[PDB]
Amino acid sequence: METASAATVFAAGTTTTSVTVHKLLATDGDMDKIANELETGNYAGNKVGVLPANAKEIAGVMFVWTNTNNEIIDENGQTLGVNIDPQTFKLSGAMPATAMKKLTEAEGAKFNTANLPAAKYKIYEIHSLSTYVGEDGATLTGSKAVPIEIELPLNDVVDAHVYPKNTEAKPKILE
């Protein structure tokens, strides 16, 4: 199916028309050194060229796109009447209809940006839709993720990408 429209729509505001959002994790809570191993790179736009051996990648996480006042938006910038705390990750209401959301497939997840206007945006990582089995004694940590901020590509990159990180570590209470 061709969804390009029978005439000209949106666009002409960026150097690329899509973004791929990934998910990174640490092996032993190392997200702090990893985030300094990434602030040195230009990873506001381009895909991570050098990962550490204390880093790893995971498919089957869910995330939603939002605006700078933490409102849930559609893939053209219309706001759905729902908001999210950066600290609590709680929703001001129930799950939206047309909102901009997807899960990681095998390396990441694609989001089309051509229909967004030239502005700043955010991404929130919601474990409320059925995810990969980490919480059942697996090699996953159960650490809290922190939210992402992004501005649309006006940069010499070949493709745009995103790298969400954690900042909490495993509990010391449980044996």
Side-chain angles (χ1 to χ4, degrees):
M1 192 276 166
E2 183 179 73
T3 189
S5 273
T8 183
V9 305
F10 311 114
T14 55
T15 56
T16 277
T17 53
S18 279
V19 60
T20 305
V21 44
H22 302 263
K23 181 62 186 184
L24 308 195
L25 235 302
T27 53
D28 207 59
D30 308 281
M31 297 264 63
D32 303 272
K33 56 191 290 189
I34 297 173
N36 282 269
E37 290 312 287
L38 299 186
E39 84 175 35
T40 182
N42 300 331
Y43 315 135
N46 85 99
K47 161 165 184 181
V48 175
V50 46
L51 295 174
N54 56 265
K56 78 198 177 166
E57 308 167 302
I58 59 181
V61 61
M62 175 56 120
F63 28 67
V64 311
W65 272 57
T66 47
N67 232 253
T68 54
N69 291 333
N70 333 97
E71 272 193 294
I72 314 185
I73 67 147
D74 189 17
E75 72 218 309
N76 58 73
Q78 179 156 22
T79 72
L80 280 295
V82 186
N83 167 256
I84 306 168
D85 204 295
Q87 309 302 310
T88 83
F89 274 24
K90 87 82 46 66
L91 292 159
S92 67
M95 264 283 157
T98 60
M100 181 59 144
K101 57 211 172 59
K102 195 178 162 73
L103 295 100
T104 47
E105 34 168 82
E107 279 260 90
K110 181 183 174 180
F111 289 63
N112 163 225
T113 57
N115 346 274
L116 284 326
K120 288 175 287 272
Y121 299 94
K122 290 194 186 194
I123 297 95
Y124 282 75
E125 193 185 318
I126 312 301
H127 274 235
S128 310
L129 295 307
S130 64
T131 180
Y132 162 64
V133 180
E135 70 171 325
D136 200 38
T139 31
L140 299 210
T141 309
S143 41
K144 177 256 182 55
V146 274
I148 336 172
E149 62 289 295
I150 194 169
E151 194 172 7
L152 292 191
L154 207 302
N155 193 349
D156 196 31
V157 312
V158 178
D159 290 304
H161 306 253
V162 213
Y163 298 94
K165 299 168 224 66
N166 295 11
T167 194
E168 183 182 79
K170 71 82 160 173
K172 75 195 177 188
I173 309 90
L174 292 174
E175 204 73 281

